[PDB]
Amino acid sequence: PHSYGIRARTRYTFQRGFREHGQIRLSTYLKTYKVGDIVDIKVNGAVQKGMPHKYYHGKTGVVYNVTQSSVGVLIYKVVGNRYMEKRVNVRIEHVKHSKCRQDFLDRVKANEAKRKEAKAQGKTVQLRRQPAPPATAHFVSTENNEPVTLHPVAYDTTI
């Protein structure tokens, strides 16, 4: 009871979203991909050509090659006791840029914007992110906000 055809068990994985069938938005074809870009793989069931295998659906990797209609994407997959370099040729309908990559780009930009300004003002810059610190001391007032005393409620059937 187990077939190993390419698209076995992809019944929901390769479905277009509800009320998202039909036309493919043409901005997908106008995106530019360069070697070193970090892309997400997300299979469009409406484009049967250039389909990556279902293992790569929802995976993120680096573009190593650019062709007319496709990109080569480097993906590491565990195959035992080690990761293996996989090179998947994907048509650009199944690919999108990682949104964190622009977030990392902008954070670095803001880091150097802070660093240069801190240098000129002759002060520290403190470019390190920090985990959410313990909450600080405050002074909750009760004027016009008097405490309400609660009690546990008695049991009663609501059917």
Binding site: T67, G72, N81, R82, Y83, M84
Partner: protein, 59 residues
């Protein structure tokens, strides 16, 4: 009875010598690239090396 598959110890075995990651190199083989890109890159790189050689020598 044969056909006795189980994955119970297999994950433990994989982690004994860990999930190894492949070595990352500065340069990857251009045999994975488009052949037209690869052919022209040979000429571009050859000219860059020639130009770097001349400028050092003529300095």
């Amino acid at each position: 009875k044969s056909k006795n598959h189980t994955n119970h110890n297999q994950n433990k075995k994989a982690h004994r010598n860990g999930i190894k990651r492949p070595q990352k190199h500065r340069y990857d083989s251009l045999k994975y690239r488009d052949a037209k890109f690869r052919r022209n890159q040979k000429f571009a790189n050859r000219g860059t090396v020639e130009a770097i050689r001349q400028a050092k020598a003529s300095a």
